[PDB]
Design a binder for this molecule. Structure first.
Ligand SMILES: [Zn+2]
Lengths: 292, 213
């Protein structure tokens, strides 16, 4: 009898962040070695989802991971990942003039931006003026402005995406070079940074704590040691639901420590609460990595 | 004398089962399981002001640690007696709303899906737009359409306010006499069906509409 096994997906979540880098690097070399499989870093309940034809094919893949890339991971695990960024409102000026290639290039724009992290945002308004005249010429420039934007900033996350309004601009007649436009976006972004003050990032995330009591003095202490702000605290038999909130989405080691502290008898659920700022240390970490 | 008209309540009932059913698998403890059991029991109980013998009996089954999917199916099918499913608007009613949209047609959904959905929103990959039709508190059919990004990322949709594959729903306000308007796009779950089953509260969806204009 034959074995009718088409495509099978398996999750291969790493141990630490070092393993994450190893995995990402492995996915590259492996996909080039054998293009008969697929690997994605998204899904709904996983970190690294790999899919291929035949279970034996999957075994060969996971083998390479631990044997060739020495990455520590667990096959068949759930995980998630996020990252938010936005704050303040203002009017930014954008001017670019150069001539470093025989031809000249010029770009002049005036845009206003506002936050919209409430349940998420994503919007670039047009005022039908500035660098546009015809009615059907408005969606062109508006979409173009976002093209560059996604090349300098991150889009497509929990509570992110800017809401801008194109109200003015000056172009006249010049040459349009991609590299020149992309580098210009980076320059304007730098000018706006020192003016608009880019902080906050990931807001306050409420976390419902659930774990056995009788250790109220120990449990609560471990929570405060994680910058947790407790709102509720009602027991139920032996366990207790400690309705809290911590300004930090995801689980950057939060689950690892909690798992060990509760011996694997502690869980929680994160949810958007209020417009606050994440841990200064982590916030400045990602903002530095994004500028490196 | 049995009469109730609240799709949200029925959806909520099946949604609270998640904090419990998941615990029956992910939680390696018995105390936390009992805690969630208490929550789920009280959650549904608070909805039905006057619980009947069968409702109580069904709740008793939910208290069992060996709550199979078949047992849930029977219970859910029994709860459907206290609610009503959605309705698919006829072409005449649809064209009555989308008077500026010619050649518009609603895709043939499933009966089961129409029993757990409070709003129908299909996406058209022709011009990249999503058409969402529903019924407001006045029992009137209301529908709108908005542009959608040709990309599927992960985020927190304003509607169900959960975590799943989302996209963007861009909608412009009503153009004034001068021809000016305001643009406002928000994150929306691509598959409105999967999003409907994640609708913890209909007010969450209503709030989203309040932000669209
Ligand atoms: Zn949704």
């Amino acid at each position: 009898m034959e074995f009718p096994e088409p495509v099978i997906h398996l999750s291969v979540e790493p141990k630490s962040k070092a393993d994450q880098d190893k995995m990402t690097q492995a996915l590259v070399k492996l996909q080039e070695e054998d293009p008969t499989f697929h690997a994605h870093t998204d899904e709904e309940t996983g970190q690294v989802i790999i899919g291929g034809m035949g279970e034996l094919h999957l075994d060969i893949l996971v083998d390479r991971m631990k044997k060739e890339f020495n990455v520590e991971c667990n096959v068949g695990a759930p995980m998630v990942s996020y990252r938010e960024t936005f704050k303040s409102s203002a009017q930014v000026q954008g001017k670019f003039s150069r001539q470093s290639g025989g031809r000249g290039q010029y770009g002049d724009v005036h845009i206003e931006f506002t936050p919209n992290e409430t349940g998420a945002g994503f919007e670039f308004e047009n005022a039908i003026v500035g660098g546009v005249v015809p009615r059907e010429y408005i969606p062109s420039v508006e979409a173009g402005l976002k093209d560059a934007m996604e090349n300098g900033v991150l889009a497509g996350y929990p509570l992110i995406d800017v809401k801008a309004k194109l109200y003015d601009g000056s172009y006249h007649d010049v040459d349009s070079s991609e590299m020149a436009f992309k580098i210009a976006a980076s320059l304007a972004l730098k000018e706006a940074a020192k003016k608009c003050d880019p902080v906050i990032l990931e807001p306050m995330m409420k976390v419902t704590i659930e774990m056995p009591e009788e250790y109220m003095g120990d449990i609560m202490g471990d929570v405060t040691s994680r910058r947790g702000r407790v709102d509720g605290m009602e027991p139920r038999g032996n366990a207790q639901v400690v309705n809290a909130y911590v300004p930090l989405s995801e689980m950057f080691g939060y689950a690892t420590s909690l798992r060990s502290n509760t011996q694997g008898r502690g869980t929680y659920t994160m949810y958007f609460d209020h417009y606050a700022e994440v841990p200064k240390s982590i916030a400045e970490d990602i903002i530095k990595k994004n500028k490196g | 004398m049995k009469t109730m008209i609240y799709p949200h309540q029925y959806n909520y009932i099946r949604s609270v089962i998640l904090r419990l059913k998941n615990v029956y698998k992910t939680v390696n403890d018995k105390e936390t399981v009992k805690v969630i059991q208490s929550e789920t029991y009280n959650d549904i109980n608070e909805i039905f002001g006057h619980i009947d013998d069968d409702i109580e009996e069904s709740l008793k089954v939910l208290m069992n640690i060996r709550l199979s999917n078949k047992e849930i199916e029977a219970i859910l099918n029994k709860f459907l007696e206290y609610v009503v499913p959605f309705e698919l608007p006829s072409p005449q009613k649809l064209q009555k709303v989308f008077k500026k949209v010619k050649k518009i047609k609603i895709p043939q959904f499933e009966e089961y899906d129409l029993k757990v959905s409070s709003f129908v929103g299909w996406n058209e990959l022709a011009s990249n737009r999503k058409y969402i039709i529903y019924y407001d508190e006045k029992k009137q059919l209301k529908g709108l359409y908005g542009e959608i990004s040709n990309q599927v990322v992960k985020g927190f949709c304003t509607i169900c306010n959960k975590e799943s594959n989302v996209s963007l729903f861009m909608k412009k306000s009503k153009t004034n006499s001068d021809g000016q308007y305001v643009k406002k796009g928000d994150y929306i779950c691509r598959d409105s069906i999967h999003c409907n089953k994640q609708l913890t509260d209909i007010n969450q969806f209503y709030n989203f509409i309040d932000k669209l204009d």
